[PDB]
Amino acid sequence: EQLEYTIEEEVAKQTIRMWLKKCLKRIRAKQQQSCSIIHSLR
Amino acid sequence: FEKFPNRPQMVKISKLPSDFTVPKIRESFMKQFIDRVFSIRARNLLEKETAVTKILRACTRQRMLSMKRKVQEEELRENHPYFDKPLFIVGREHRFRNFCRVVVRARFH
Amino acid sequence: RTPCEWGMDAISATLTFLWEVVGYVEGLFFKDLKQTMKKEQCEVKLLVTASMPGTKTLVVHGQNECDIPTQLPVHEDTQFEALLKECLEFFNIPESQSTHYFLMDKRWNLIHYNKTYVRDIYPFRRSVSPQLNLVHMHPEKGQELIQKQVFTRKLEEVGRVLFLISLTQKIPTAHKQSHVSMLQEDLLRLPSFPRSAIDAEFSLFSDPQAGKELFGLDTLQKSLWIQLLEEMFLGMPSEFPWGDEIMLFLNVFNGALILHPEDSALLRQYAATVINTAVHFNHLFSLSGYQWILPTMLQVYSDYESNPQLRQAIEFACHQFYILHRKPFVLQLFASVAPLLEFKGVSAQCLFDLLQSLEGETTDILDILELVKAEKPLKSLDFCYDLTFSISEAIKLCVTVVAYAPESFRSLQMLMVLEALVPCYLQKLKRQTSQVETVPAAREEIAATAALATSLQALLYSVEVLTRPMELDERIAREEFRRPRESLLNICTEFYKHCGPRLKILQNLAIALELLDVKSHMRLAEIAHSLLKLAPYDTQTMESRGLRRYIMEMLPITDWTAEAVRPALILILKRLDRMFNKIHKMPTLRRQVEWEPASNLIEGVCLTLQRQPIISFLPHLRSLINVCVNLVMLSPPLPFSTAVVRLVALQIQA
Numbered sequence: 001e002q003l004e005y006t007i008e009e010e011v012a013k014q015t016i017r018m019w020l021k022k023c024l025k026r027i028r029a030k031q032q033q034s035c036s037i038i039h040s041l042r
Numbered sequence: 043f044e045k046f047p048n049r050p051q052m053v054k055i056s057k058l059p060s061d062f063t064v065p066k067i068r069e070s071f072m073k074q075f076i077d078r079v080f081s082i083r084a085r086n087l088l089e090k091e092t093a094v095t096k097i098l099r100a101c102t103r104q105r106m107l108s109m110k111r112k113v114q115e116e117e118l119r120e121n122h123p124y125f126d127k128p129l130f131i132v133g134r135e136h137r138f139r140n141f142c143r144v145v146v147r148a149r150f151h
Numbered sequence: 152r153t154p155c156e157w158g159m160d161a162i163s164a165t166l167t168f169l170w171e172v173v174g175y176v177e178g179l180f181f182k183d184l185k186q187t188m189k190k191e192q193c194e195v196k197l198l199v200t201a202s203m204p205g206t207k208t209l210v211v212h213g214q215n216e217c218d219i220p221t222q223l224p225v226h227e228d229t230q231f232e233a234l235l236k237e238c239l240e241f242f243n244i245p246e247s248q249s250t251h252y253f254l255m256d257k258r259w260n261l262i263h264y265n266k267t268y269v270r271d272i273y274p275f276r277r278s279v280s281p282q283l284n285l286v287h288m289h290p291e292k293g294q295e296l297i298q299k300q301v302f303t304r305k306l307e308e309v310g311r312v313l314f315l316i317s318l319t320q321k322i323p324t325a326h327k328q329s330h331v332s333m334l335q336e337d338l339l340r341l342p343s344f345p346r347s348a349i350d351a352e353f354s355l356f357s358d359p360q361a362g363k364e365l366f367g368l369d370t371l372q373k374s375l376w377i378q379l380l381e382e383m384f385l386g387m388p389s390e391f392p393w394g395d396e397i398m399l400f401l402n403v404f405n406g407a408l409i410l411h412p413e414d415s416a417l418l419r420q421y422a423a424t425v426i427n428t429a430v431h432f433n434h435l436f437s438l439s440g441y442q443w444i445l446p447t448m449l450q451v452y453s454d455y456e457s458n459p460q461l462r463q464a465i466e467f468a469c470h471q472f473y474i475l476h477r478k479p480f481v482l483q484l485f486a487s488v489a490p491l492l493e494f495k496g497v498s499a500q501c502l503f504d505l506l507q508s509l510e511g512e513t514t515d516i517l518d519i520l521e522l523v524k525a526e527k528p529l530k531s532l533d534f535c536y537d538l539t540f541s542i543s544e545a546i547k548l549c550v551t552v553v554a555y556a557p558e559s560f561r562s563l564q565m566l567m568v569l570e571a572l573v574p575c576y577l578q579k580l581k582r583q584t585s586q587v588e589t590v591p592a593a594r595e596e597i598a599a600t601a602a603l604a605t606s607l608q609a610l611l612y613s614v615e616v617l618t619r620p621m622e623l624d625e626r627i628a629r630e631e632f633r634r635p636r637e638s639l640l641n642i643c644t645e646f647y648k649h650c651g652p653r654l655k656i657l658q659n660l661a662i663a664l665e666l667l668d669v670k671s672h673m674r675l676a677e678i679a680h681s682l683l684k685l686a687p688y689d690t691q692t693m694e695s696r697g698l699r700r701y702i703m704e705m706l707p708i709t710d711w712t713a714e715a716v717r718p719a720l721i722l723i724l725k726r727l728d729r730m731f732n733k734i735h736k737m738p739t740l741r742r743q744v745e746w747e748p749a750s751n752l753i754e755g756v757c758l759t760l761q762r763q764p765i766i767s768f769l770p771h772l773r774s775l776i777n778v779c780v781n782l783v784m785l786s787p788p789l790p791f792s793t794a795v796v797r798l799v800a801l802q803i804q805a
Contacts, residue, residue: 038217050535055554055613062609065547066535067478074438075482076556084454085413091353093409097402101345104395113390 048121070120152193154258162196163303166310170317179318181330195274199311199347200337205270209234211254211283213242222280225269227342232265238285253293254283262296266354271343298361301352305368312375319382331386338383338400345399348376349406373407374417380404381424385431385524393435398443401428405447412451412461415517422468423522429475430525433532437476445487453491453501463516466508471519473509473540475532481545482552489564492571499571503579506542506572542576543599546606554613563631566638573642576603577649584657593660600650604666607646611671614639618677620684629689636682637697643667643675644697644705651708669715675701676719683726687733687740693748703755707762720759721771727752728775735782746791753779753794760801767805776802 051069058064083089119125127134155161173179188194194201205225211234212220221241223234235254244252255262263272263283273281322330338344351369356362380400404421411417425444429436452465472480491497520527549565549572556562584596617636647666654663667675679701686692702723711720734741756775760766779795787795 035217042217053551053555055551057613057615058554058609059605059612061605062550063547065478065544065551067482067548067551071438071479071482072552072555075486075552076559076561078439078561079457081455081457084451087353087356090410094349094351094353094406097349097406097409098346101399101402104398105342108394108396109388109390109392 043118043122043125046122049123050121051123068120156260158259159261159300159303159307163307163310166196166307166314170310170313173314173317174321176321180322180326181318181333184318192275196307197311197314199308199315200334200341201274202337202341203274204276206273206276206280208280209269209273209283210280211238211285213285214287225273227270229269230266231263231269234269235265235285242285248287250290251287251293252285253288253297255286256281257284258282262293262300264297264301264352264355266352267301268343271347294358295360298355298358298365301355302361302365302368305365305372309368309372309375312372312379316375316379316382319379319386327386328388331383334383335387339396345402345406348403351410370411370414370417373411374420377404377407377417377420377424381427384428387431389431390434391432393432397435397440401443404444408447408451412455413458415460418461418464419517419519420522422464422517422519425468426471426475426519426523427525429472430523430532437479437532439483441472441476441480441483442487445484446491449488449491449497449501449505452505453497456501460516462508463513464519466505467513467515467517467519469505469509470513471529474529477531477533477536478548481540482548485545485549485568486561486564489567492567494567494571499575502568502571503575506545507579510539510541542572542579543602543606546572546576546603550606550610550613553610557614557616557635563635563638566635566642570638570642573603574645574649577646581653590661593657596657600654600666601664603646604650604664607643608668608671611639611643611667611674614678615674618674618681620681629685629691632685633682633692633695636678637695639678640675640682640697640701644700647705647708669713669719672709672716673719676722680722680726683723683730687730687744690745693745699748699751699755702752703758706755706759711759711763711766717769720766721769724756724769724771724775727756728771728778731775731778731782735778746787750791750794753791753798757794757798757801760798760805764805767802772802 053064053067053069053072055064124130132139185194185198188197188201195203205227207225208222209225210220210222212218221238223237225234231254235252238254239249239252253262261272319331319334341347352365356366356369358365380403384400404425407417408421429440432440448465448468452462455461469484488497488502492499492502520529523529546569549569552565553562580596580599584592614635617639621632650666654666679698682692682695682698686695686698692698706720706723709716709719711717734744760772766772776798780799783792783795
C-alpha cells in the first residue's frame, strides 16, 4: 500500500513536471532576453 | 554454577620474594591492561583553541578508524575457576584442544 | 520556507519556548517526529540529531548587477573563510581594502561568519545552489551584525538541546530504553556530532563589546550538552557493548572542561556526570574506561595549580573514583599520566600532590554528590573489596605490573611513573621526620624505608629478563631496549644515594638492615653490563644518564668489602677492559668514538678506587690500567688523559 501511494503521488507530480518544464522554458527565455538587455546596458 | 561461591582468578607471580604481598588484582584486568605557578598560559584563548583542535583531530581519526545470556556466560567464566574446561584437566587454552577443534570443525553447483 | 526579514529571529524565539510545551504532549514519539519532519524537510531546525548532505556548490554575485558570478565548490570541511578568499582573488580586490567585504545572503538577510562551515548553513542539497553576495561595508558594522546573528543562532541551538532533553525526559519508562538507544545511533551517524557539540567561536570571544554574552551562552550550551549525554547514558543497559566510539561521546565532556574549567557550576556538573557514568558502566570503567577521561582532568589539574577550588573539586572526584573502582582506577590513572610526565605536561609534583590528596578525606565544597544519581554512601562497586591507601601501595602496584610483563610498553610506563614518584616519597618521609621529631615518627620512617626496600628488591628480582643483551626501526628498537634499563638504574641509584647516608643519621637517634641484598646488587650490575655491551656502538647509550650515574655515583657507595658482592664489580671491570681492548684493536671504531663520556666512566672507576682501597688488589683491574695507558698512545684529548693519569696515581698509591 505504501508502494502504491508512492507511485500515485510520484506520477501526479510527474504530470505536473511537464507544465513546470514548459513554463520554465517560457520564463527562462524572457529572463535571458532581459539579461541580454542588461548586458547591453553594460 | 551459580549455586557454588564465586572465586575469580587473581594475579600471581612466582619469581618474587616471600615478603612481597603481591596485591590482589584480577587476572583479566592485568591481561587486557598489558595487551592494549602563574596560570595565565591556560586562560589564553589560543591554548584552548589548540586543545580543542587536538580533540577534534583525535575524533576525526577515530571516526576514520571506525545479550544478557552472553553477559552471564562471561560473568560465570570469570568468576569460576573451572568453566568451559572439559574433564577439569584438558585445559581451555591448550594446543591439543586447538588441534581437536580444528580437526572436528573442519568442513568444506 | 517563506523569506522574511525577521524569520530567523522568530524561529529563535519559538525555540526558546517550544521545550516548555513539549512536556505536555502525550503521544509524541521520536519515530513519528523524525518521519514527519523529514517529510516536511525542516528536521534540521528542530532536531540536533539531523543529518543532511549539504550543498555541493555555491554561486556568489559581485558588487555589480548581472556581472559574471562565480560558481565555487563546497566540500564537507570548507568554511566561509576560504570561499571569501577565493572571491577576493577572483574579483581583484586590493589587500588594503580586504577587510571591508563580507559574504551575505540577501534573500535570508544573513551575514556569514568566517569560521562557520558552509555545509551547516545550507544543508539542503537541491537543484538550486544558494545565491550569495559579496557586499562591502565598514568592518565595525559587519562585525556587529556577525555578533548579533551568531548570538541568535547559538540561542537557537540551545533551544534545540533543551527541546531534545525535555522530549527524552517526558516519555513512558517502558519505551525509554529503545528511544535512548535510537538517540545513540543517530548521534553516531552524524558526520559532525563532536564538532557541533565542542567547537566554539573563539575568534569572537575576544570582542569586548559582545564577547561576554557569547561566552555565557557557550557555557550554558556546554552544560546542556553534558546533561543530555548523561541522560542518554543512564537510559542505556548497563552492559552495552562499547568500542572505541565511546570516546566520541566522552570527549564531549572534555571539550567543556577545557573551555570552562574555572566555572564552579560547569565543573560540578562535569564531575557529577562522570561519576554517574562510571557507576552506570561499572564493567567498562572497571576495565579500560578511565583512559578517556583522566588525561584531560590531569592536564587541567596541573595547569590550574593556583585555583584551590578546581584542585579540590578534582581531588574529590578522584577520591570518589577510587572509592568506586579501587586498584584498576589507580593503574589506569598511572597509564593515563605516563605520556604527560615531564621529569606543557604533568610534573612529578602535581601527581604527587594528587596522590597526597587521595591519601586523605576531602570535603564536598561544591556539593557534587547532590547531582549524583546513586546511593549516597557510595560503597565499592566490586564486592571483593573500606580502606585508605598510601603511596607504598601504588609502588607495589607498579612493581607488580612490571613483574607481570617486564618486556612491555606498559611496564616501561610504570617504570617511568616509579622514577618520577620515588624521590617525592623520600622527600615526604624526610619532611615528616623534620617537622615532628618524635620517636614514633622515626619508627614509622624505618618501617616505610624497609617496605620500599623490599618492594624494590622484588622489582629487581622480577626484572631478570632485561639482563639479556642486545634506519628508524633501529632507533626505535634501541630506544625500547635502553629506556627501561636506564629507568631502573636511576630508581635504584637515587634510592641508595638518598637513603644510605640517611640511615646512619636517623639511627643516631635511639642495627642497620641491608637495603639491597647481594643478589640484587648482582642483578643491577648485570643490567649495567648488558647496557654497556651496546654502549660503544650507539652514541646515545654512551651518553645515557642512568648508566653514567650508576658507574660514577653508586659503585663508590656500595661496600665492596664482602666477597659475595665483589663479583658484581668484577663483571663491570671485565666489561670495561674488554670494551677498551676492542676500542684499541680496530681504529675504525676509534674514528667515531666519543671519549668525553668514557672519561666519566674512568672517573667513576677511580672514584671507587679512592673511596675503598681494598678494590686495588684484585687482578682484573691491572689489565684495564695497562690497556688504558696503551690507549693513551693519535692522542686522546685532555679530559681523558687527566683521568687516566689520576687512575695511575691512585693505583701507585694503593
